[PDB]
C-alpha cells in the first residue's frame, strides 16, 4: 500500500477542474524545496558530479538540474 499509483498521469481533460487541481501546481515544488532546504550539502555534491560529467557548459547545468530532481524523489 506504499506504492499508490498517482492518477494525475491519466488526467481527464474537461472544462470543470479535476479532483485536486488547486493543490497540483505546488505539489512537487514543495517536496523538492523541503528536501533542498533540509539537505543543503547535496547541492554541493550535485554540482561536483554535474561538473565532472557535463563536457559542455549547458550540459553540466542539465545534469545538475536532473540530479536535484532525482534526489528528492529517490526515483
Amino acid at each position: 500500500a506504499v506504492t499508490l499509483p498517482s492518477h494525475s498521469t491519466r488526467k481527464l481533460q474537461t472544462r470543470s477542474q479535476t479532483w485536486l487541481e488547486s493543490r497540483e501546481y505546488t505539489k512537487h515544488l514543495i517536496k523538492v524545496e523541503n528536501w533542498i532546504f533540509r539537505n543543503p550539502g547535496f547541492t554541493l555534491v550535485a554540482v561536483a558530479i554535474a561538473w565532472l560529467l557535463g563536457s559542455s557548459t549547458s550540459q553540466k547545468v542539465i545534469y545538475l538540474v536532473m540530479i536535484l530532481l532525482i534526489a528528492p524523489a529517490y526515483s
Binding site: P5, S8, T14, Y25
Partner: protein
C-alpha cells in the same frame, strides 16, 4: 434566455444554406445558434446519466487483524505449521528466529516461526464499469422570444412554455427532436457514443463519494481486492498489502496492520472527475456531446405581425453580459396584442442608420395585457451608440458604450478557440463546421497528430509537461538542424496544452 449570463457562451452563426450546423455541447458551456432567418435558440447540455453499472473489483482500504497465533520448531526439525495456515482468511508469514538451550530447544541455530493473523476488512471501495449503451445525455433548449427575466434559470415548467424543451439523447435513440410550439422543432443528430470515451473509465465509490477513475489506474492500486459483487465475506486476494510482519531479533514476530488508506488514496486520485449518484444511476456533470442541428423546420414565429404603436418603457436598465452583448428588458404599455417590437441601434439620431446586429431575432410582444414585459439582447458596435426602441416621437433611447476593439475581438476569439482546442482536442474542429475541405481535412491531420501525441507523451502531468517543454524549447533554440521546428512545435503542444488550465 438560459444562456445569457453564462461566462462560457459561444455564438455559432451561419449554416450550409439553412440546412444544419455542427456543435459540440460541453458541460458548463452554452451555445447560441443564430441563423439567417430563424429564431435564435440556446442549447445547453445539463446532465449525463450513466445507468446499470456492474462492479469489477473492491479494494479494502481499512483492515483489522483479529486473533493471531504462532508456532516454532527447533533447529533442524522441519519448519513450523499452524492449523490455521490452510485457511484463506488468515495472512501468515514464516521466518527464522534464533533458538537455543534457553528457549527450551536442544540445538543452537536458526529455528522456524510462522505467525498467522485473521484478516477482516471494515471499509472498501467498489469500482463499477461503464458501458456506452448506458449514457443518457439531457439537453435543455431555449429560444429567444416571448420571455422576460423570470425565464432564464427558472426551470419550473418547460413542456407548457413553447420556449423551453429538454431532450434526452441515448445511443439507442441518437436523433431526437424538440417541440417548440410556434417556432417549429429543432432536430439534433447527436453522437452519444464518441463522448468522454467511457470505454476506459470506471466509477469509484469510497465512503459516499464517487469519482470517475481511469481503468488503468484502477487496475494498479496495491490494496487487498476481491473479485466482484460479494456482499458476504469475500476472499481478499493480496492480503499482505496491508499487514506488516516485524521480527524484533529473538523468537518474536509481531503483526500490525497499516491504518486507513482513505486519505492516501484521496490524495492519489488528484486527477479524477468527481461525479455523483442519485440511486442506481450515476449522474456526471462534466464531459461533452457532439451534436448536429437540423434546423430546416425551425420557423420564425411572428414575422407577419404588425408593428407597435407607442409607449415603451425601460425596466431593469440594460447590462453587459461579459461579451459585449446587451440585455435589454422593455415593458410595452398597450393593448395592441401580438405586435412586433421595432428595436434597433443607431449612431447620431438624425439618420438612424443601423450599426449592430441583433442576437434575439425578430423580437415580438405576445401578451395582450397592458403591462407586458419582454427581454431582448443586442450586439452593439464598438464605441458609443444609442439603443432606439420604438417608432415616432415616443421612442425611448439609451446611451451605450461598448469598450473594446475589433483587434481585441479577434484576439479574444483566438484565445477562446485555443482553449477549446486544448480541452476537446480533435472534436474542436466540429464546433461551427458546415463541412468542407478544411474543417474535414484539418480534422484528419489534427487526429493524426493527436494520436501520435497522446501515444507518445500521453502520460505526463502538469509539472512534468512544463519541465519537458522547457527542455524541448531549449533543444530548439540550440542544435541548429532541420529537427528544430520539430522540437519547438513540441514545445507549443506541451505549453499551451497545459498552461491553459
Amino acid at each position: 434566455i438560459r444562456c445569457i449570463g453564462v461566462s462560457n457562451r459561444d455564438f455559432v452563426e451561419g449554416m450550409s444554406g439553412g440546412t444544419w450546423v455542427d456543435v459540440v455541447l460541453e458541460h458548463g458551456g452554452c451555445v447560441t445558434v443564430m441563423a439567417q432567418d430563424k429564431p435564435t435558440v440556446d442549447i445547453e447540455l445539463v446532465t449525463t446519466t450513466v445507468s446499470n453499472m456492474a462492479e469489477v473489483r473492491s479494494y479494502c482500504y481499512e483492515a483489522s487483524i483479529s486473533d493471531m497465533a504462532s508456532d516454532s520448531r527447533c533447529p533442524t526439525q522441519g519448519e513450523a505449521y499452524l492449523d490455521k495456515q490452510s485457511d484463506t482468511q488468515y495472512v501468515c508469514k514464516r521466518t527464522l528466529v534464533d533458538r537455543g538451550w534457553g528457549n527450551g530447544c536442544g540445538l543452537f541455530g536458526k529455528g522456524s516461526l510462522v505467525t498467522c493473523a485473521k484478516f477482516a476488512c471494515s471499509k472498501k471501495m467498489t469500482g463499477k464499469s461503464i458501458q456506452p449503451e448506458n449514457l443518457e445525455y439531457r439537453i435543455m433548449l431555449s429560444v429567444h422570444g416571448s420571455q422576460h427575466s423570470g425565464m432564464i434559470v427558472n426551470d419550473t415548467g418547460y413542456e407548457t412554455d413553447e420556449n423551453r424543451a429538454k431532450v434526452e439523447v441515448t445511443p439507442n435513440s441518437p436523433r431526437a427532436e424538440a417541440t417548440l410550439g410556434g417556432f417549429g422543432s429543432l432536430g439534433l443528430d447527436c453522437e452519444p457514443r464518441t463522448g468522454l470515451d467511457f470505454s476506459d473509465l470506471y466509477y469509484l465509490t469510497m465512503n459516499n463519494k464517487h469519482w470517475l477513475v481511469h481503468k488503468e489506474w484502477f487496475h494498479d492500486i496495491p490494496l487487498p481486492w476481491h473479485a466482484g459483487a460479494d456482499t458476504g465475506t469475500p476472499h481478499w486476494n493480496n492480503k499482505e498489502a496491508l499487514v506488516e510482519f516485524k521480527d524484533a531479533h529473538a523468537k518474536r514476530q509481531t503483526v500490525v496492520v497499516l491504518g486507513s488508506q482513505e486519505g492516501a488514496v484521496h490524495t492519489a486520485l488528484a486527477g479524477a472527475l468527481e461525479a455523483e449518484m442519485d440511486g442506481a444511476k450515476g449522474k456526471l456533470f462534466s464531459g461533452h456531446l457532439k451534436c448536429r442541428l437540423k434546423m430546416d423546420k425551425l420557423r420564425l414565429k411572428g414575422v407577419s405581425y404588425s408593428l407597435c404603436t407607442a409607449a415603451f418603457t425601460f425596466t431593469k436598465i440594460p447590462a453587459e453580459t461579459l461579451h459585449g452583448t446587451v440585455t435589454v428588458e422593455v415593458q410595452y404599455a398597450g393593448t395592441d396584442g401580438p405586435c412586433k417590437i421595432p428595436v434597433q441601434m443607431a449612431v447620431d439620431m438624425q439618420t438612424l442608420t443601423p450599426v449592430g446586429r441583433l442576437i434575439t431575432a425578430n423580437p415580438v410582444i405576445t401578451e395582450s395585457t397592458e403591462n407586458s414585459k419582454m427581454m431582448l439582447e443586442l450586439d452593439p458596435p464598438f464605441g458609443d451608440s444609442y439603443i432606439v426602441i420604438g417608432v415616432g416621437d415616443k421612442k425611448i433611447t439609451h446611451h451605450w458604450h461598448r469598450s473594446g476593439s475589433t483587434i481585441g475581438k479577434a484576439f479574444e476569439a483566438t484565445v477562446r478557440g485555443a482553449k477549446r482546442m486544448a480541452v476537446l482536442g480533435d472534436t474542436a474542429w466540429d464546433f461551427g463546421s458546415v463541412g468542407g475541405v478544411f474543417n474535414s481535412l484539418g480534422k484528419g491531420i489534427h487526429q493524426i497528430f493527436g494520436a501520435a501525441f497522446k501515444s507518445l507523451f500521453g502520460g505526463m502531468s502538469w509539472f512534468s509537461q512544463i519541465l519537458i517543454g522547457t527542455l524541448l524549447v531549449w533543444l530548439g533554440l540550440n542544435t541548429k538542424n532541420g529537427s528544430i521546428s520539430l522540437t519547438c512545435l513540441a514545445l507549443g503542444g506541451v505549453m499551451i496544452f497545459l498552461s491553459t488550465a
